[PDB]
Design a protein around this nucleic acid. Structure first.
Ligand SMILES: [Mg+2]
Ligand SMILES: [Mg+2]
Ligand SMILES: [Mg+2]
Ligand SMILES: [Mg+2]
Ligand SMILES: [Mg+2]
Ligand SMILES: [Mg+2]
Ligand SMILES: [Mg+2]
Ligand SMILES: [Mg+2]
Ligand SMILES: [Mg+2]
Ligand SMILES: [Mg+2]
Ligand SMILES: [Mg+2]
Lengths: 237, 39, 257, 343, 66, 59, 103, 101, 94
RNA sequence: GGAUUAAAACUAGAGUAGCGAAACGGAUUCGAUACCCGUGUAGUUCUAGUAGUAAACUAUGAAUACAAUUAUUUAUAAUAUA
C-alpha cells in the first residue's frame, strides 16, 4: 500500500501538539524518539554483485572486448538485441544465491538414497562456534553425514591436493565408507557383547513393528467383515 | 575417419580430398615410404 | 559436546595423584586420559541426535531398552560409573581455600553402620568389606565394576557388573557371564528376569527399578594395571575400599528428612 | 560472509527435492530426508524450518519439500519410518552379497586398468546421454558430439597412417577397432571422468561384510530366524514361491515341500497370523531394490515324516560326467554324416 | 516464499534460496540495536511498554518480557 | 454399460439439443458459460482439497 | 470358520522387493491409491508425448484409434493430456484419416 | 487359470485339427487367445510353439520365427524339434540344419 | 505439458459447499426387508427356508420401523473452509 | 480521398430438400390482428452484380518512452547428472 507518513512522524505531530498547547505534559517517549531518529527512506536499492557465486550484475562485454570469433565462426561487429534492450530490472531483482555444494549434495543423496533414512536435526546451535580442520572428516560436535563428504571435498579442492571435483569427491566417499564400516561393526559387536554378558531387551525393532502391524490388522479385519456383509447384501439385491 | 572412410555412403570430404590431391598425396607418401624406402 | 568435568584440586591430583591409592601417572591414565577418550567417543556417537542434549545418566536410561544403541548405552554407563568412582575416591570433596579441611579424616556414619547391620545379618563392616573383595575377585573374570547398592526394600546388597553394567537398571546389570558354564539356579534367575520383563505394559519394554548406588569401585585394568599390576586387583580393591570419601557415601545415603 | 555461512547452514544441507510426498507407485528406497526435533523443541513447535509446525503433530519426525508455498503452508508429512526399516534390516543382520557384480564398490581396486569389454557400446551409451527426446534431445547431444569429433578428425588421420598403414591398405576391421580404441582414450582424457548417479552399492542401506559369525550363549549362531507374515495365501500365479513381509521388506518365500494347513484354514486372511522365516540370502537389483529369499519354518516336531511327497527343489543337471564330452554336435555331426554316407 | 513477496521490502532482501527470500542479517542487527536502544530509553523514562503477540506459543515470552 | 457409453458420448444431451435451432451467437455464449462453470468447479475442487490437507496437518 | 473368499477390490497386493510400512495394511492405503490412481504407464508408452509429429500418423488408424472413443469421437485435452499443439495436430490427422477412409 | 490351462486347451484344439471331421477351428483358437488376453495371463514359448504348429505356410512360419527373435528373444530344444518335425525335411536335411544350429 | 495445469479461482466472497454429502451408514433393518422380499421372489411366496429372515425383520421392526437413532452426522468442511480460505487462496498482497 | 464491409434488401440466371416474413386455417382467450399447432410464398443456396449500415461493442482511434508484484501456459536460449 501507500508508503505511509504518520507512523514515522509521530514525533512532529506530538511536537505541534505541545507547542500549540493541546497537550500539557510531554510524553515519556518524546526525548527517546527525538534522540533516536527513525528510518524514513523507504526506497528501492540496486545491487551489483551476487554474493553467492560472485558474478557482477550490471556490466556488458562490448564488441571491443571480444575481438576473437564466436563458436559459430563469426566476428561480432554490432550489438545484438539482448544488449540493446535495457535491463534495470536485474539490479533491483534479488539475486538467486547459488552454491557448487548443492550439486554435490544432490549427487550424493541420489547415489545413496538410504542415507536419507538417517535422521537429521535441522535446529541450529551456535553456528559461529565451529572450528573444523577438514583434513579429517571426523569432527567434534557434528554427526557423520553427507555434509562431511561435501566439506572434505571442498577442502581438498581449496588446498589443491586434487584436480577436478570428481577426484576429491571419490576420495571423500571412500573415506566415508570406511568410517561407516567401523561404526556399524562397533554397533553389532557391542550388542553381541551385551547379550553375551546377560543384558536383556524388552522389545526389539522387528517385534515392535509386528505389534504395530497387529494393531492395524485388527481394525482392517473388522472393516473387511463389515464391508463384505454390506456388499453381499447389495449383491443379493 | 574423414576422407579415409571405407563406408558405402561416404561424405563430401572424399570429393574435397580428391580436388585437393590430399588422398593422392598421402597415398604416394606412404607408398614411397613402403616400397622404395623398404619401410 | 560432552567435556570431562573439572575435578577439585586438579593440580594436586595431576602433580602427585590420589594418596595411598593411585600414583600420579595411574590417576592420569584413569581419569585425564580414559575419561577424555570416553567423552569424545560419546560425543562422536551421539552428535546430531536428540541424545546430545542429555547427560550420560539419562542417556543410558533412555537407551537401555533399545538393543542396537548398545554403543551409546555402554559409553554413557562407563562415563557415569567412572565419575562416580573418582568422586568417591576424591581426597577432598571441596577445595581447602583458606580452611584446614584436611585436619580431619572422613568416617562412615552411624546410619550407614546400622544399614550394614540389618543388611548383612548384623555383620561387621570389615566382614562385609572382605566378602566384597572376595566376590569381586571371584565373579568379574575380566573388566567390570563393583557396587554396593540400595534397593526399594531399604536394604543394601552387593552387585557385580561385567564390562559396563548399570546398577540402576536391572536387566542391564550385566551381572552374569554366560561365556562359561552356568548353573541351574542362575538360569532360573535369568528366566524370572525375562518373565518380569514380559510383564511390562509399555511398548518401550521397560520395567521399573530403583536400585541406587551407594559405593562404586572400578575394576577396569585402566585403573590398576599401571601401579598394582597383573593379578593384584585384589590388593587394589582392598586399598580403595579402605580409603574412601565417606562424606560422599553418606550424602548418597538417604536421610529421610 | 553471510552467503558463505548460508551455504553451510543445516537448511542448505537438505538436497533440493520436489518428488511427491503422497506416492502410490512401487517404492524401493527412501525419497526424502527425515527431519527430527528434540522433545524440548517439539514442545515449542520448533523444527528448524521457516514455519512452526502445528501443535497436533505429536511425532518427532517428518519429511518435507518446500519451506513455504503460495498457500502459506509448509508441505510436510509427519512421517519417517524408513529409519525403522533400516534398523530392522540391521537386526536381521544378513549381509548383502555382490552377486554377478564383483569388486565391492565401497573399496578401491586396481582392476579397472583391465578394461577390455566392448567399450564401443558403453561409449554409444555415454553419447546418448539425453535419452528423453529422440528427434530433439539426443539429436542435439549427437550434434555436439559430432562437432567435437569433426574437430578431432585430423589427429586420428595422422595417428592411424603413422601407426598401422597396413590395416589401411588391407581394408580390415582392425580399422574400426582402432577407431574405437582411439576414441576410447580420447574419452579417458580430461573433461570425461564424469559424474555417475547410478546406485552404487547398498545405497546406504547397510555397510556389512560377508563372513562374520553371530555368537550366542547357546553357541555360535548358524541360522537366522525372524518373524514375518504371508501376504498372499496362494503363491504368485505362474510362480512357485510366495511373498512374505519380513521386517519392512517383501521377500520371496519358499516352502518346505508342503504348505501348512494353516493356509487352507485361514484362506485370504492369512496376513492375520505371524510365521517364522529363515533368510537364505539378500541381494540387490539395478533399480535399487533389495531382493531377499526366505524359507518358511513349520515345526515338524510330533508330526509325520512327510512321506508320500515329491521333491520340488532338486537339480536333474548332476551330469558333469555327461558334460565331460563335447555334446556340441561338432563331432557328432561328423559321425552322423559318416552314417549318412553309410558308415 | 517468493510468490508472497511484498515489493516494498526490497531493501531488506539479501537474496532468494530454496524458494524463499533471505533477509539481510546485517540490516536486521542494526535495526535491532536501534529498537533495543529505544525500548531501553522508554524504560528509563518510566513509560508503559506493551508487548503484543497473538500467534500460538508466544505467551511465555511475552509474559517474561513484561 | 450401454447407459454409460451414451452418457460418456453425450448422445442424450446432443439429441435434446438438436431438436430445435439456436443462433450461432447464443451457441457461443452458452459454450463460454459452460466452460467457465467447469473451470470454476475444477478450481473449487482444488481449493477444497487444500483445505482438507491443511486440516489433516493441523493448520 | 466363516466366509473364506474375498475379491481384490480391498486387499493390497504388495510387490516383491518393495519396502513397506505398517500403514500400508490399513484400509486408508486403499482409499489413498484409488484416489491418486494416475495412469503413468500411458505417460511412458504414449507415442505422441514421446515427441513424434502426430500428423505423421495419418495413415495409421490402429495408432490413432487409441485417442478416440468407441463411437469415434475425439477426447478433450483434459483427458488426452497432450499439449495444445500436439492435440491440434492429432485431431487434424484423425479428421484427415476419416476423409481418406482408412479410419 | 494359469498359462498351462490355456496351452492345455490348445493341445485339445491340436487333437481336433489332427482328426479334422468338423469345421476348421482357427476361429476357436482366436476366441481362446481373446479369452486369455481378457484373463491377462502371460504367454510362453509353449503357447507360441503351439501357434507355430498352427501355422501353415512357409513365409508365415518365417515371420513367426523372426518376430519371435524380435520380442521373446529366446528359443529352446522343444522349438527346434518342432520346426524340424514340421518342415518335412529329409533325414540328412534335419541332420545338416541341426549340425549348423 | 509435463503435468496437468492448475486452475486458479478469482477472489471469491466465500468458499462454501452448498450441500455436503455424508457417508451415511447402511441400515440392516431395511437390508433384512429387502433380502426377505427377494427370497420370497426367488423361492416362492412365503418361502419356508427364509422363516429366519422373517424373524429377523420381525425383531428389527417390532418397535419404530426405522430402527434406532444414535446421532445424525454431517460434515464440518464449511467451517474449515471459512477458516482457511483467506490463508490458502493466495491473493496478492493488500 | 480510396478499398473492404454481417444480416436484411434489389436486378439477372440457375436451385429450392430442411427452416421460414407474409397469407389461409388449428387452438387459447371476453376478445388474441400474438405467444402454440398445420399448409407454406418471398427469403435462406450458388453464380454475376447494386447499396455501404448494425448493440459494425472492448459501448474504450493510432503511434512512441516509461512505472511495483505474483501465478500459469507459449516459443526459443543450458547449469550440465538432465
Ligand atoms: Mg533494430
Ligand atoms: Mg479518411
Ligand atoms: Mg454471422
Ligand atoms: Mg432472384
Ligand atoms: Mg407458423
Ligand atoms: Mg461494393
Ligand atoms: Mg438506417
Ligand atoms: Mg452508426
Ligand atoms: Mg463481442
Ligand atoms: Mg486500432
Ligand atoms: Mg502502423
Amino acid at each position: 500500500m501507500k508508503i505511509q507518513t504518520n507512523a514515522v512522524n509521530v514525533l512532529q505531530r506530538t511536537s505541534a501538539y505541545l507547542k500549540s498547547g493541546l497537550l500539557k505534559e510531554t510524553p515519556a517517549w518524546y526525548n527517546v524518539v527525538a534522540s533516536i531518529p527513525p528510518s524514513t527512506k523507504f526506497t528501492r536499492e540496486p545491487r551489483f554483485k551476487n554474493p553467492s557465486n560472485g558474478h557482477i550484475i550490471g556490466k556488458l562485454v562490448d564488441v571491443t572486448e571480444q575481438p576473437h570469433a564466436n563458436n559459430k565462426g563469426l566476428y561480432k561487429t554490432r550489438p545484438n538485441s539482448s544488449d540493446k534492450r535495457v535491463g534495470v530490472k536485474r539490479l533491483y531483482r534479488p539475486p538467486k544465491l547459488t552454491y557448487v555444494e548443492d550439486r554435490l549434495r544432490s549427487l550424493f543423496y541420489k547415489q545413496h538414497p538410504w542415507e536419507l533414512s538417517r535422521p537429521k536435526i535441522l535446529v541450529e546451535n551456535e553456528i559461529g562456534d565451529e572450528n573444523y580442520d577438514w583434513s579429517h572428516m571426523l569432527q567434534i560436535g557434528r554427526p557423520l553425514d553427507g555434509e562431511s563428504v561435501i566439506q572434505r571435498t571442498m577442502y581438498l579442492i581449496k588446498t589443491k591436493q586434487y584436480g577436478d571435483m570428481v577426484e576429491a569427491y571419490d576420495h571423500a566417499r571412500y573415506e566415508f565408507y570406511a568410517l561407516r564400516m567401523q561404526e556399524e561393526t562397533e554397533q553389532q559387536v557391542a550388542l553381541e557383547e551385551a547379550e553375551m554378558f546377560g543384558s536383556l531387551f524388552g522389545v526389539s525393532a522387528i517385534e515392535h513393528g509386528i505389534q504395530k502391524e497387529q494393531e492395524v490388522l485388527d481394525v482392517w479385519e473388522k472393516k473387511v467383515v463389515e464391508e463384505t456383509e454390506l456388499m453381499a447384501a447389495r449383491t443379493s439385491n | 575417419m574423414g576422407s579415409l572412410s571405407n563406408e558405402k555412403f561416404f561424405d563430401i570430404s572424399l570429393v574435397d580430398s580428391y580436388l585437393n590431391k590430399d588422398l593422392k598425396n598421402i597415398s604416394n607418401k606412404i607408398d614411397s615410404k613402403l616400397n622404395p624406402t623398404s619401410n | 559436546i560432552h567435556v570431562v568435568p573439572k575435578l577439585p584440586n586438579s593440580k594436586a591430583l595431576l602433580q602427585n595423584g590420589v594418596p595411598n591409592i593411585l600414583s600420579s601417572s595411574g590417576f592420569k591414565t584413569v581419569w585425564f586420559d580414559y575419561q577424555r577418550y570416553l567423552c569424545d567417543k560419546l560425543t562422536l556417537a551421539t552428535a546430531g541426535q536428540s541424545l546430545e542434549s542429555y547427560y550420560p545418566f539419562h542417556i543410558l536410561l533412555k537407551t537401555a531398552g533399545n538393543p542396537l544403541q548398545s554403543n551409546i548405552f555402554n559409553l554413557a554407563s562407563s562415563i557415569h560409573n567412572n565419575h562416580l568412582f573418582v568422586e568417591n575416591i576424591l581426597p577432598s570433596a571441596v577445595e581447602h581455600g583458606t580452611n584446614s579441611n584436611a585436619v580431619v579424616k572422613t568416617e562412615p556414619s552411624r546410619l550407614f553402620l546400622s544399614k550394614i547391620k540389618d543388611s548383612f545379618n548384623g555383620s561387621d563392616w570389615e566382614v562385609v568389606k572382605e566378602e566384597m573383595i572376595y566376590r569381586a575377585e571371584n565373579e568379574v573374570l575380566g573388566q567390570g565394576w563393583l557396587f554396593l547398592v540400595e534397593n526399594n526394600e531399604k536394604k543394601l546388597f552387593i552387585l557385580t557388573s561385567n564390562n559396563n553394567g548399570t546398577p540402576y537398571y536391572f536387566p542391564r546389570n550385566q551381572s552374569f557371564d554366560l561365556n562359561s558354564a552356568i548353573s541351574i539356579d542362575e538360569f532360573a534367575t535369568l528366566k524370572q528376569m525375562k518373565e518380569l520383563i514380559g510383564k511390562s505394559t509399555k511398548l518401550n519394554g521397560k520395567v521399573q527399578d530403583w536400585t541406587m548406588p551407594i559405593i562404586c569401585v572400578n575394576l577396569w585394568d585402566h585403573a590398576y594395571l599401571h601401579d598394582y599390576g597383573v593379578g593384584n586387583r585384589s590388593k587394589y580393591v582392598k586399598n580403595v575400599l579402605d580409603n574412601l570419601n565417606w562424606s560422599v557415601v553418606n550424602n548418597r545415603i538417604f536421610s529421610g528428612i | 560472509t553471510l552467503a558463505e555461512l548460508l551455504g553451510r547452514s543445516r537448511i542448505a544441507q537438505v538436497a533440493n527435492n520436489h518428488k511427491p510426498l503422497t506416492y502410490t507407485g512401487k517404492k524401493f528406497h527412501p525419497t526424502h530426508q527425515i527431519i527430527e526435533t528434540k522433545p524440548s523443541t517439539l514442545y515449542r513447535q520448533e523444527w528448524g524450518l521457516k514455519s512452526a509446525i502445528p501443535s497436533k503433530i505429536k511425532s518427532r519426525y517428518l519429511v518435507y519439500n518446500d519451506l513455504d508455498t503460495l498457500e502459506r503452508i509448509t508441505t510436510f508429512e509427519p512421517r519417517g519410518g524408513t529409519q525403522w526399516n533400516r534398523l530392522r534390516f540391521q537386526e536381521m543382520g544378513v549381509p548383502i552379497v555382490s552377486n554377478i557384480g564383483r569388486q565391492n564398490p565401497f573399496f578401491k581396486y586396481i582392476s579397472r586398468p583391465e578394461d577390455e569389454s566392448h567399450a564401443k557400446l558403453s561409449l554409444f551409451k555415454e553419447m546418448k546421454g539425453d535419452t528423453d527426446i529422440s528427434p530433439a534431445a539426443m539429436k542435439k547431444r549427437l550434434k555436439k558430439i559430432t562437432a567435437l569429433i569433426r574437430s578431432f578428425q585430423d589427429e586420428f588421420k595422422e595417428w592411424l597412417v603413422e601407426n598401422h598403414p597396413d590395416e589401411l591398405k588391407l581394408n580390415s576391421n582392425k580399422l574400426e577397432d582402432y577407431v574405437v580404441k582411439f576414441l576410447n582414450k580420447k574419452l579417458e582424457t580430461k573433461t570425461n571422468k564424469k559424474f555417475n548417479t547410478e546406485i552404487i552399492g547398498t545405497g546406504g542401506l547397510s555397510y556389512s561384510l560377508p563372513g562374520k559369525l553371530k555368537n550366542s550363549p547357546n553357541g555360535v549362531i548358524q541360522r537366522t530366524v525372524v518373524p514375518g507374515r504371508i501376504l498372499n495365501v496362494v503363491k504368485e500365479n505362474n510362480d512357485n514361491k510366495w511373498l512374505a513381509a519380513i521386517g519392512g521388506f517383501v521377500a520371496d518365500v519358499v516352502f518346505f515341500q508342503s504348505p501348512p494347513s494353516s493356509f487352507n484354514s485361514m484362506g485370504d486372511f492369512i496376513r492375520m497370523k505371524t510365521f517364522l522365516f529363515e533368510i537364505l540370502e539378500a541381494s540387490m537389483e539395478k533399480n535399487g531394490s533389495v531382493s531377499m529369499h526366505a524359507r518358511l519354518l513349520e515345526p515338524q516336531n510330533d508330526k509325520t515324516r512327510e512321506f508320500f511327497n515329491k521333491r520340488p527343489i532338486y537339480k536333474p543337471l548332476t551330469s558333469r560326467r555327461a558334460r565331460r564330452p563335447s555334446v556340441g554336435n561338432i563331432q557328432e555331426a561328423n559321425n552322423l554324416l559318416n552314417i549318412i554316407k553309410g558308415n | 516464499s517468493t510468490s508472497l513477496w511484498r515489493s516494498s521490502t526490497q531493501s531488506y532482501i539479501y537474496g532468494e534460496y530454496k524458494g524463499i527470500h533471505i533477509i539481510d542479517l546485517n540490516q536486521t542487527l542494526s535495526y535491532l540495536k536501534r529498537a533495543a536502544k529505544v525500548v531501553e530509553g522508554v524504560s528509563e523514562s518510566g513509560g508503559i511498554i506493551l508487548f503484543l503477540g497473538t500467534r500460538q506459543g508466544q505467551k511465555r515470552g511475552l509474559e517474561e518480557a513484561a | 454399460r450401454l447407459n454409460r457409453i451414451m452418457f460418456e458420448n453425450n448422445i442424450p444431451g446432443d439429441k435434446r439439443s438438436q431438436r430445435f435451432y439456436m443462433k450461432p451467437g447464443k451457441v457461443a455464449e452458452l459454450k463460454r458459460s459452460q466452460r467457465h462453470r467447469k473451470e470454476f468447479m475444477m478450481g473449487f475442487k482444488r481449493l477444497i482439497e487444500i483445505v482438507k490437507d491443511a486440516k489433516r496437518k493441523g493448520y | 470358520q466363516q466366509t473364506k473368499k474375498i475379491d481384490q477390490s480391498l486387499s493390497k497386493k504388495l510387490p516383491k522387493g518393495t519396502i513397506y510400512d505398517p500403514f500400508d495394511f490399513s484400509m486408508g492405503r486403499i482409499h489413498l491409491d484409488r484416489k491418486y490412481q494416475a495412469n503413468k504407464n500411458s505417460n511412458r508408452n504414449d507415442i505422441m508425448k514421446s515427441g513424434a509429429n502426430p500428423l505423421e500418423f495419418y495413415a495409421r488408424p490402429r495408432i490413432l484409434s487409441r485417442y478416440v472413443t468407441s463411437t469415434g469421437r475425439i477426447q478433450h485435452r483434459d483427458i488426452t493430456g497432450l499439449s495444445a499443439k500436439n492435440q491440434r495436430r492429432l485431431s487434424k490427422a484423425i479428421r484427415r484419416c476419416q476423409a481418406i477412409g482408412l479410419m | 487359470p494359469n498359462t498351462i490351462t490355456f496351452n492345455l486347451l490348445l493341445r485339445n484344439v491340436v487333437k481336433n485339427s489332427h482328426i479334422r471331421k468338423t469345421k476348421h477351428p482357427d476361429d476357436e483358437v482366436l476366441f481362446y487367445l481373446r479369452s486369455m488376453r481378457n484373463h491377462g495371463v502371460f504367454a510362453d514359448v509353449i503357447t507360441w510353439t503351439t501357434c507355430y504348429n498352427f501355422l501353415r505356410d512357409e513365409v508365415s512360419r518365417q515371420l513367426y520365427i523372426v518376430q519371435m527373435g524380435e520380442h521373446l528373444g529366446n528359443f529352446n530344444v522343444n522349438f527346434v524339434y518342432t520346426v524340424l518335425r514340421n518342415g518335412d525335411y529329409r533325414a540328412e536335411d534335419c541332420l545338416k540344419v541341426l549340425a549348423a544350429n | 505439458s509435463g503435468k496437468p495445469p492448475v486452475y486458479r479461482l478469482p477472489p471469491l466472497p466465500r468458499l462454501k459447499v452448498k450441500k455436503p454429502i455424508i457417508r451415511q451408514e447402511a441400515n440392516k433393518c431395511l437390508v433384512l426387508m429387502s433380502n426377505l422380499l427377494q427370497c420370497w421372489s426367488s423361492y416362492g411366496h412365503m418361502s419356508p427356508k427364509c422363516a429366519g429372515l422373517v424373524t429377523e425383520l420381525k425383531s428389527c421392526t417390532s418397535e419404530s420401523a426405522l430402527g434406532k437413532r444414535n446421532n445424525v452426522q454431517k460434515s464440518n468442511i464449511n467451517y474449515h473452509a471459512a477458516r482457511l480460505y483467506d490463508r490458502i487462496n493466495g491473493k496478492p498482497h493488500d
